Amino acid sequence: ALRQARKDAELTASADSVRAYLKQIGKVALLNAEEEVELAKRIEAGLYATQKLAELAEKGEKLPVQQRRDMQWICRDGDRAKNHLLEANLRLVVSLAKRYTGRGMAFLDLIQEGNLGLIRAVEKFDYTKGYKFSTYATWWIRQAITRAMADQARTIRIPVHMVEVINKLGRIQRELLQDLGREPTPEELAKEMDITPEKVLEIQQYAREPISLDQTI
């Protein structure tokens, strides 16, 4: 009744979203320099085979079966390659996702917001340079995550170029709270940002995250 309900409490609270996907990303083993290059070559060969087959599809000349099945097999090889690469590169995405925990947006979505940037990275990766796909994709993961966190983190919309000021305001206010000890003043904030002290007042009123109705007071 206590131990059984303890076991039931152990069994019921099972997935928890994060542990459900950590399992999934845990399965497909990560690549090394050769396999990344091979799968990139395979991807771009597949895309080249599709952009080739477009010609023979739209224009004409119904080619013999063997070469067609070969080209289809190269398309499928490209698909397999991009899918296997995307299934490989994920622990990077979660490792970068684990930086932006409790920053308006939920930790769970930021991984997928990372995965979009990852897929764009996979789209626009250049193997000829031979960069390491982590060190390459770091750009796209970050830019995608922070581009999402710019918009969807807040209830009210504020563009990235007008929220970066609020984030950096937060950071440097934390810095000035850390160093000087006390709270700094909008004037000194405007002296730090090099702006009109009537703007930092305007940006704080935006920085007021809205309050609920059904709250026990």
Partner 1 sequence: VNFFDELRIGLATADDIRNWSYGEVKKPETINYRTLKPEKDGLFCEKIFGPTRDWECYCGKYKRVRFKGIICERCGVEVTRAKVRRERMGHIELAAPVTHIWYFKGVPSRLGYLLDLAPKDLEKIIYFAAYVITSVDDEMRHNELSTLEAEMAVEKKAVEDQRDADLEARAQKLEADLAELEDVRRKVRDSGEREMRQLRDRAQRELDRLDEIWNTFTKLAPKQLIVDEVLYRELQDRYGEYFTGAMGAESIKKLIENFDIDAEAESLREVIRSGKGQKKLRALKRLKVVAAFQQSGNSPMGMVLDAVPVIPPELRPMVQLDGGRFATSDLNDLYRRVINRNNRLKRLIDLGAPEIIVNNEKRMLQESVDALFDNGRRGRPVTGPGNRPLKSLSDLLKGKQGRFRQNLLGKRVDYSGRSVIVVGPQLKLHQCGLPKLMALELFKPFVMKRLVDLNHAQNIKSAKRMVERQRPQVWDVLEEVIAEHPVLLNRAPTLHRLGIQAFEPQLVEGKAIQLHPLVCEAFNADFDGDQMAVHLPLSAEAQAEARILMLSSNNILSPASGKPLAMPRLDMVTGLYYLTTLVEGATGEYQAATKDAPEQGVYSSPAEAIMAMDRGALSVRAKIKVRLTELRPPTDLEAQLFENGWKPGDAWTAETTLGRVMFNELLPKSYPFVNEQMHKKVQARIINDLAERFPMIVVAQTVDKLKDAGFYWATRSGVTVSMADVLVPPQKQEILERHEAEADAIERKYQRGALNHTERNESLVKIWQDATEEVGKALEEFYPADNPIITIVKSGATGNLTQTRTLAGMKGLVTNPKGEFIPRPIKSSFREGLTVLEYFINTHGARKGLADTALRTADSGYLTRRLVDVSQDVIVREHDCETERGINVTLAERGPDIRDAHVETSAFARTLATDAVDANGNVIIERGHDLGDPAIDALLAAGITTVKVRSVLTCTSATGVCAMCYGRSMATGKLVDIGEAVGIVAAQSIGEPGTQLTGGLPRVQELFEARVPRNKAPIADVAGRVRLEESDKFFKITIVPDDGGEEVVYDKLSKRQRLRVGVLSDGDHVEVGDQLMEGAADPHEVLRVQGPREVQIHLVKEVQEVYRAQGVSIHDKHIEVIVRQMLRRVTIIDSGSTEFLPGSLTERAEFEAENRRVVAAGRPVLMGITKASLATDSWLSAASFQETTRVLTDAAINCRSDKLNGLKENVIIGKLIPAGTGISRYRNIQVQPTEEARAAA
Partner 2 sequence: RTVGELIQNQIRVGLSRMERVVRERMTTQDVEAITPQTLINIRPVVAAIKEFFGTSQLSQFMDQNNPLSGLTH
List interacting residues with partner 1 (CB under 8 A).
12-13, 15-17, 20-21, 24, 83, 86-87, 106, 108-109, 112-113, 115-116, 119, 151-152, 155-158, 205-206, 208-214
We find the least distance from the C-beta atom of residue 96 to partner 2, in angstroms, to be 23
Q: Are 21 and 80 in contact (CB under 8 A)?
A: no
When asked if residue 216 is in the footprint of partner 2 (CB under 8 A), the reply is no
Q: Which one of the spans 2-10, 88-96, 115-123, 175-183 is the region binding partner 2 (CB under 8 A)?
A: 175-183
When asked if residue 181 is in the footprint of partner 2 (CB under 8 A), the reply is yes
Out of 182, 194, 208, 211, name the contact with partner 2 by CB under 8 A. 182
Which positions ≥6 away from 2 have C-beta within 8 Å?
none
Q: Are 79 and 46 in contact (CB under 8 A)?
A: yes
Site string for partner 2, 127-156 (x = CB under 8 A): ------------------------------
Out of 175, 177, 202, 204, name the contact with partner 2 by CB under 8 A. 177
**Pair of tokens at residue 177:** 């709270």
Q: Are 121 and 143 in contact (CB under 8 A)?
A: no
d(CA 160, CA 168): 12
Environment class of 78 (CB within 10 Å of its CB; exposed 0-12, middle 13-18, buried 19+): buried
Choose the one of partner 1, partner 2, none that binds residue 182, judging by a C-beta under 5 to 8 angstroms depending on kind. Answer: partner 2
